[PDB]
Design an enzyme around this catalytic site. Structure first.
Site, PDB file in Angstrom:
ATOM      1  N   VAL A 142      53.312  46.005  51.963  1.00  0.00           N
ATOM      2  CA  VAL A 142      52.592  47.056  52.655  1.00  0.00           C
ATOM      3  C   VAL A 142      51.572  46.500  53.647  1.00  0.00           C
ATOM      4  O   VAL A 142      51.441  47.042  54.752  1.00  0.00           O
ATOM      5  CB  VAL A 142      51.921  48.002  51.632  1.00  0.00           C
ATOM      6  CG1 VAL A 142      50.874  48.905  52.280  1.00  0.00           C
ATOM      7  CG2 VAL A 142      52.980  48.845  50.937  1.00  0.00           C
ATOM      8  N   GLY A 143      50.895  45.409  53.318  1.00  0.00           N
ATOM      9  CA  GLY A 143      49.918  44.855  54.237  1.00  0.00           C
ATOM     10  C   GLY A 143      49.386  43.530  53.737  1.00  0.00           C
ATOM     11  O   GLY A 143      49.778  43.030  52.674  1.00  0.00           O
ATOM     12  N   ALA A 153      42.416  39.415  54.551  1.00  0.00           N
ATOM     13  CA  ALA A 153      41.917  38.053  54.393  1.00  0.00           C
ATOM     14  C   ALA A 153      41.800  37.654  52.929  1.00  0.00           C
ATOM     15  O   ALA A 153      41.800  36.457  52.623  1.00  0.00           O
ATOM     16  CB  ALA A 153      40.562  37.896  55.085  1.00  0.00           C
ATOM     17  N   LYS A 192      48.344  44.086  44.287  1.00  0.00           N
ATOM     18  CA  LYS A 192      47.648  43.187  45.198  1.00  0.00           C
ATOM     19  C   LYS A 192      47.614  41.791  44.592  1.00  0.00           C
ATOM     20  O   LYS A 192      47.119  41.609  43.476  1.00  0.00           O
ATOM     21  CB  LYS A 192      46.227  43.664  45.497  1.00  0.00           C
ATOM     22  CG  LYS A 192      45.460  42.656  46.347  1.00  0.00           C
ATOM     23  CD  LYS A 192      44.247  43.251  47.048  1.00  0.00           C
ATOM     24  CE  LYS A 192      43.151  43.635  46.073  1.00  0.00           C
ATOM     25  NZ  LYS A 192      41.957  44.190  46.782  1.00  0.00           N
ATOM     26  N   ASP A 207      39.131  51.207  47.932  1.00  0.00           N
ATOM     27  CA  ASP A 207      38.721  50.094  48.807  1.00  0.00           C
ATOM     28  C   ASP A 207      37.198  49.932  48.876  1.00  0.00           C
ATOM     29  O   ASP A 207      36.584  50.074  49.936  1.00  0.00           O
ATOM     30  CB  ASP A 207      39.295  50.267  50.223  1.00  0.00           C
ATOM     31  CG  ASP A 207      40.815  50.187  50.270  1.00  0.00           C
ATOM     32  OD1 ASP A 207      41.404  49.481  49.423  1.00  0.00           O
ATOM     33  OD2 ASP A 207      41.425  50.827  51.166  1.00  0.00           O
TER      34      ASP A 207
END
Lengths: 344, 7
Positions: free
Chosen positions: A32-33, A36, A55, A170
């Protein structure tokens, strides 16, 4: 480890030049992405039947700063247990011991549509806006009661499903400035939980009008747009600003009165405008709190004081510790080991 | 509150 969970079977795959080793439970991983600090795959959780975000943290123990940031994020995510806040569904490592502990994977709510996305294909009713803002404030009352500050509330950090149910995602672990309170955009004073209320005010105005409220291009352009609506700082607020240079800059500005918000928002629910005036106060100590805002008459159809829970106290004393990389790593491993999954 | 479309 005494009375620990059984180790699941892991399988390895390479995805975007990254090795992912995850339990069999998580299937059909697709990227998905990447940030950093880690990369994210959507996956199907065969245990819960839900799609999830997995993640993989990027080199979490590379330095002292990264190791402490990893521990801080895991401690934060393990604490938050609230319907309107991101929760940790799972945390795992393929490592069987601290000596081979290198990788950390966090499993959370999959961001489908955010708040920006839902306005691209429909016009929200005032009922929709009431319910969305109510949920943001309900989540905020919870996190603020534990002395957690989100610090970076904006529509792209708010996940919304097809039932108009919302979760705050987030968290700022310490980009657009349009939603940032003026006292932290220019470092006037210390972070306070009141900065999240400012962001809610900016978000709510945008949901009501369809226009970004303060779409400035740099810090000065943004400050001038803010001061045009809410007025220049009075003498009481100037006392609280620590940097003399910031005070001299503010005193250099032509003084401006607070505007009448009702003129600025004709056609909007007057209770909505009244709440906005209480959130977008320039002095953070005079802003409405999340708990007080839930009692505002704008939310009378949703407010239930027996269903707006507070958090357990959150021990942040680790923030003043100065430890070796391997000590933060060992603390993180302890938190992976001690993790108790949510029910169902 | 009723229902939203996915984009």
């Amino acid at each position: 480890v005494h009375m620990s969970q059984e180790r699941p079977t892991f399988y390895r795959q390479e995805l975007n030049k990254t090795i992912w080793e995850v339990p069999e439970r998580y299937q059909n991983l697709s990227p998905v992405g990447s940030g950093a600090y880690g990369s994210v795959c959507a996956a199907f959780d065969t245990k819960t039947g839900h799609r999830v975000a997995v993640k993989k943290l990027s080199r979490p123990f590379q330095s002292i700063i990264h190791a402490k940031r990893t521990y801080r994020e895991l401690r934060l995510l393990k604490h938050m247990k609230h319907e309107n806040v991101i929760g940790l569904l799972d945390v795992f490592t393929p490592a069987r011991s601290l000596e081979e502990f290198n990788d950390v994977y966090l499993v959370t709510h999959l961001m489908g549509a955010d708040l920006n996305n839902i306005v691209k294909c429909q016009k929200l009713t005032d009922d929709h806006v009431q319910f969305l803002i109510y949920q943001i404030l309900r989540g905020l009352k919870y996190i603020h009661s534990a002395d957690i500050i989100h610090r970076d509330l904006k529509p792209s950090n708010l996940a919304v499903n097809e039932d108009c149910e919302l979760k705050i995602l987030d968290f700022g672990l310490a980009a657009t400035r349009w939603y940032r309170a003026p006292e932290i955009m220019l470092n006037w004073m210390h972070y306070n939980q009141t900065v999240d209320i400012w962001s809610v005010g900016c978000i709510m105005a945008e949901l009501l009008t369809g226009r970004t409220l303060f779409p400035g291009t740099d810090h000065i352009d943004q400050l001038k747009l803010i001061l045009r609506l809410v007025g220049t700082p009075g003498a009481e607020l100037l006392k609280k600003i620590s940097s003399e240079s910031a005070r001299n800059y503010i005193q250099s500005l032509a003084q401006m009165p607070k505007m009448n918000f009702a003129n600025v928002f004709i056609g909007a629910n007057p209770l909505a405008v009244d709440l906005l005036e209480k959130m977008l106060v320039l002095d953070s100590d005079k802003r409405i709190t999340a708990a007080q805002a839930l009692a505002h008459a704008y939310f009378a159809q949703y407010h239930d004081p027996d269903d707006e829970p507070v958090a357990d106290p959150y021990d942040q004393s680790f923030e003043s510790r100065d430890l070796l990389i391997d000590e933060w790593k060992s603390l993180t491993y302890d938190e992976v080991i001690s993790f108790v999954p949510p029910p169902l | 509150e009723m229902t939203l479309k996915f984009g």
